[PDB]
């Protein structure tokens, strides 16, 4: 016996990089088998099943596959809020909405660290702020090519602050703050800690 459609899988939010394909999931049940149609900002989205020229494929399940995420300066027709709608003669079911998003990481830091000159046993503090990014760029540090870990308690890394409680001469070196999101790494310009005594 025939029954109205029901959404089985709603689409989940998606951040993806420019250059990468993407898939928004949807799945319905119904008898007769429901058709699946997608809407972005409440506007019907063309698929290859509508028009062979589309860069978007509607998969057998009704998920929406973007062969390329269009996001240029002056047009970006793919990022936004999406909903799938399942239909048969008996009715319609709509999904919850999902955002589709292109990740972004700037090459150039919000605030570079600063040279510090300090004497043995005195605190050395370096502050950093990474580029704007989505998702937000998390922070790490490097001295003369090698990662810094706060695994060793004499260094405190927290927020944008790197603190060395009691400077050692062996702490003299080139410091860079590193910026990281799904897009890639980004390195600040190098900072000189100098240690007197």
UniProtKB/Swiss-Prot annotation:
Ranges where the Ig-like C2-type domain occurs: 5-101, 107-194
Cysteines engaged in disulfide bonds, as pairs: 26-84, 128-177
Subcellular location as annotated: Cell membrane; Cell projection, Axon; Endoplasmic reticulum-Golgi intermediate compartment membrane
Reported modifications of this chain: Ubiquitinated. May be deubiquitinated by USP33.
Tissue: Widely expressed, with exception of kidney.
Residues of this chain annotated as glycosylated in UniProt: 97
UniProt miscellaneous comment: Maps within a region of overlapping homozygous deletions characterized in both small cell lung cancer cell lines (SCLC) and in a breast cancer cell line. The promoter region of ROBO1 shows complete hypermethylation of CpG sites in the BT-20 breast tumor cell lines, some primary invasive breast carcinomasa and some primary clear cell renal cell carcinomas (CC-RCC).
Function, as annotated: Receptor for SLIT1 and SLIT2 that mediates cellular responses to molecular guidance cues in cellular migration, including axonal navigation at the ventral midline of the neural tube and projection of axons to different regions during neuronal development. Interaction with the intracellular domain of FLRT3 mediates axon attraction towards cells expressing NTN1. In axon growth cones, the silencing of the attractive effect of NTN1 by SLIT2 may require the formation of a ROBO1-DCC complex.
Subunit structure: Homodimer. Dimerization is mediated by the extracellular domain and is independent of SLIT liganding. Interacts with SLIT1. Interacts with SLIT2. Interacts with FLRT3. Interacts with MYO9B (via Rho-GAP domain).
Family listed: Belongs to the immunoglobulin superfamily. ROBO family.
Disease: Neurooculorenal syndrome: An autosomal recessive syndrome characterized by variable clinical features including congenital renal anomalies, neurodevelopmental defects, intellectual impairment, cardiac defects, and ocular anomalies. Some affected individuals present in utero with renal agenesis and structural brain abnormalities incompatible with life. Nystagmus 8, congenital, autosomal recessive: A form of nystagmus, a condition defined as conjugated, spontaneous and involuntary ocular oscillations that appear at birth or during the first three months of life. Other associated features may include mildly decreased visual acuity, strabismus, astigmatism, and occasionally head nodding. NYS8 patients manifest bilateral horizontal nystagmus in the absence of other neurologic signs or symptoms. Brain imaging is normal.
Name listed for the protein in its UniProt record: Roundabout homolog 1
Record lineage: Eukaryota, Metazoa, Chordata, Craniata, Vertebrata
